[PDB]
Amino acid sequence: GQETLREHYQYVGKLAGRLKEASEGSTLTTVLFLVICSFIVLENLMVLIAIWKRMYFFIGNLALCDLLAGIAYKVNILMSGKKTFSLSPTVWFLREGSMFVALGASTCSLLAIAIERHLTMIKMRPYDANKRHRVFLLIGMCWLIAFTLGALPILGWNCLHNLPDCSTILPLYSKKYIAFCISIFTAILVTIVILYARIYFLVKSSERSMALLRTVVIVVSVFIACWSPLFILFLIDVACRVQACPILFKAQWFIVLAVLNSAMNPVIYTLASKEMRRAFFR
Amino acid sequence: DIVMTQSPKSMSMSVGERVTLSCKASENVGIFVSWYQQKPEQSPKLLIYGASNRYTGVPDRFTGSGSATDFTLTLSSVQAEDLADYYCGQSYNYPLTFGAGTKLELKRADAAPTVSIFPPSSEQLTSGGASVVCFLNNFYPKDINVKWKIDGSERQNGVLNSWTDQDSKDSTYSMSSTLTLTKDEYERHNSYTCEATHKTSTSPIVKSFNRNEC
Amino acid sequence: DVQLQQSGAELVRPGASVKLSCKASGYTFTDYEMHWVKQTPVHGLEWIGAIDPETGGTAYSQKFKGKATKTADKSSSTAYMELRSLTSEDSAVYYCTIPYYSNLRFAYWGQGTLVTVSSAKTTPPSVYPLAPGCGDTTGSSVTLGCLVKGYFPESVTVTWNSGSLSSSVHTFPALLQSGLYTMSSSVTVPSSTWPSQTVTCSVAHPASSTTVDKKLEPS
Ligand SMILES: CCCCCCCCCCCCC/C=C/[C@@H](O)[C@@H](N)COP(=O)(O)O
CATH class of the missing domain: 2.60.40.10 (Immunoglobulins)
Known part of the structure; x- marks a missing residue:
């Protein structure tokens, strides 16, 4: 299926002409991002072996999401660039949809941590058996929405045989699918920032009350500092017509800024008890 | 190769009228058809690439349309600096084949030689x-x-x-x-x-x- | 930013060869193809061929396999096209253009190199006065003119009474015919102007250092 990818990469502008052989390479940034993947797989593997003893499953689910995100982007670099024209479009949907299920479950799990710290606070509703029925239905819905949204192009919703709907970052994806992903990502983002402000507004109750919780809800909002410049660029992609906005060609720098969020999540969420500080005493 | 048949050959216009130029293909070309404008001893200057994607500096009166075989280019108000030659070209398969031409001209009353x-x-x-x-x-x-x-x-x-x-x-x-x-x-x-x-x-x-x- | 400077103005004998050039600036030259398009008034716009600048690989049309030959020098960021044994069919304007980002958008064109294929050394024109056929006019106006036949090369300059009359004059462009150009011009006056005053044709061919005045007398 090489000529199908050739026509879409000629429509987008990443392949210049029907005679030129492709040569998308740097050999600097494509070894840099591997060491970024080599740190995300190394950080998140250490989180999973360190836990053995409710507690820690939400941190363990998130570090599992960031593990597979580090595995899939390391897979994605080795199958992109000059190698991406040896791939079938059915293989191409697997390479790109593997990053929408891992990063989709990573962002959905951050919402599940947001509902967990909100639930056990001021009001114990008897609507939910909160023992293990809540922790299983959250993580089940975090991975069900991620696979459903992430594998939604390969089941049909793509720009195959409809070139004006082709995105410039993802040359086979649908711009209407991206606008579905923009509108529900912001719906995840405005949900987290109103719950995290509600948790800060509901710890004001009856040494002192130093409240470190204002200082941590700002530092966990590096999530908007890591993820929103990609979704500006997705909003640029759906809005800009083809070959008119050339900031979309440096989009791989906006991808890693969403994937360095997977490196920060072992730092932001494992500051309790300081496990690593004892775990390498000798 | 791929023959593109562009009509009309010439059409006499007065300022402010609407015109629509047609360009048909012998084959499926997709949406790779462009539209160019040429003035005397000047390069062809690209107006519309793609289905209907206006190049930078092309005004809102230029409108493209088409898919696979039938392609149109319309002018909602012909202005005086739009009086030039126009072409369509396929760009879907090498060799590139263009149309024959459409000359936009100024209309006046008749005059015997x-x-x-x-x-x-x-x-x-x-x-x-x-x-x-x-x-x-x-x-x-x-x-x-x-x-x-x-x-x-x-x-x-x-x-x-x-x-x-x-x-x-x-x-x-x-x-x-x-x-x-x-x-x-x-x-x-x-x-x-x-x-x-x-x-x-x-x-x-x-x-x-x-x-x-x- | 992106210009395609193109070596224009050529003039070549039949059976000889010519090598044109298109010079690129404002972008990395080895990342986009170079294309060459031929424009005649008869055949319209014709595609000659293309070339990938890094790795000198070409693709032609079958009509031009044997006429056109393309190279690319990436150290100077310019592309060359060589026409070989030209006839009169090969006299046209040759444009260079790029598929900017892709073959979807041919946004940047050159300027054209005019190629005129003639066969003569610089020859001064013969100037002949065109006077009417000794029938007195029934109409009000009197139309009369000057004929310039058989000159080479181009740029010649015609004026009427050294420029003293210019109202309602039609100077027509030249045509290449049998390797030689030919230009005509007509001036229109009322019956009271001619032959009462004197109307002469002032023609000047600078490439042969020739200037000739021809007075238009009746018969
Ligand atoms: C509900 C939340 C939704 C959020 C979903 C996660 C969004 C993250 C999108 C991740 C997509 C990144 C994958 C892109 C890879 C491309 O850079 C290369 N394959 C193209 O290189 P090439 O081979 O073309 O040279």
Whole structure:
């Protein structure tokens, strides 16, 4: 299926002409991002072996999401660039949809941590058996929405045989699918920032009350500092017509800024008890 | 290759009208069709690439459309600087094939040509040549057909035809037809005729001379 | 930013060869193809071929396999096209253009190199006065003119009474015929102007250092 990818990469502008052989390479940034993947797989593997003893499953689910995100982007670099024209479009949907299920479950799990710290606070509703029925239905819905949204192009919703709907970052994806992903990502983002402000507004109750919780809800909002410049660029992609906005060609720098969020999540969420500080005493 | 058939060949417009240019393909081209504009001794300048993607600097009056085979380009208000030649080209398979052309022109009221015929000069007959010149100037529209009749017989070999574009004041055309013979053939016949056909007259406009009496 | 400077103005004998050039600036030259398009008034726009600048690989049309030959020098960021044994069919304007980002958008074109294929050394024109056929006019105006036949090369300059009359004059462009150009011009006056005053044709061919005045007398 090489000529199908050739026509879409000629429509987008990443392949210049029907005679030129492709040569998308740097050999600097494509070894840099591997060491970024080599740190995300190394950080998140250490989180999973360190836990053995409710507690820690939400941190363990998130570090599992960031593990597979580090595995899939390391897979994605080795199958992109000059190698991406040896791939079938059915293989191409697997390479790109593997990053929408891992990063989709990573962002959905951050919402599940947001509902967990909100639930056990001021009001114990008897609507939910909160023992293990809540922790299983959250993580089940975090991975069900991620696979459903992430594998939604390969089941049909793509720009195959409809070139004006082709995105410039993802040359086979649908711009209407991206606008579905923009509108529900912001719906995840405005949900987290109103719950995290509600948790800060509901710890004001009856040494002192130093409240470190204002200082941590700002530092966990590096999530908007890591993820929103990609979704500006997705909003640029759906809005800009083809070959008119050339900031979309440096989009791989906006991808890693969403994937360095997977490196920060072992730092932001494992500051309790300081496990690593004892775990390498000798 | 892939033949692109572009219509109309030329269309006379006044300022503010709507026009729609058609470009059909022999094959499926997809949406790779472009639209170009050309002005005299200038490069073709791209207006619309893709299905309907306006290049930078192209105004809102230019509108593209089409898919696979049938393609259109419309002007919602023809302005004075849009008076140029236009082309369509396929860009889906190498070799690139373009259309034949569409000339946007200025429309005015009709004008009959003013026809004048001229003998060979005395100096050219001393050198063995003999040119007969017929001037057809200030006429509208450009649709004109000119015959050269020598003793009633049409002749087409040895004819140079020059043209002006639309005038800088009249917005009319002008034509210069020059029939060149030898001296020995020019002295053989008598009736020499420049005959013209135009919209402004049902009968053809004729101006002629006999070489014997004067 | 992106210009395609193109070596224009050529003039070549039949059976000889010519090598044109298109010079690129404002972008990395080895990342986009170079294309060459031919424009005649008869055949319209014709595609000659293309070339990938890094790795000198070409693709032609079958009509031009044998006429056109393309190279690319990436150290100077310019592309060359060589026409070989030219006839009169090969006299046209040759454009260079790029598929900017892709073959979808041919946004940047060159400027054209005019190629005129003639066969003569610089020859001064013969100027002949065109006077009417000794029939007195029934109409008000009197139309009369000047004929310039058989000159090479181009740029010639015609004026009427050294420029003293210019109202309602039609100077027609030249045509290449048998390797030689030919230009005509007509001036229109009322019956009271000619032959009462003197109307002469002032023609000047600078490439042969020739200037000739021809007075238009009746007969
Ligand atoms: C509900 C939340 C939704 C959020 C979903 C996660 C969004 C993250 C999108 C991740 C997509 C990144 C994958 C892109 C890879 C491309 O850079 C290369 N394959 C193209 O390189 P090439 O081979 O073309 O040279």
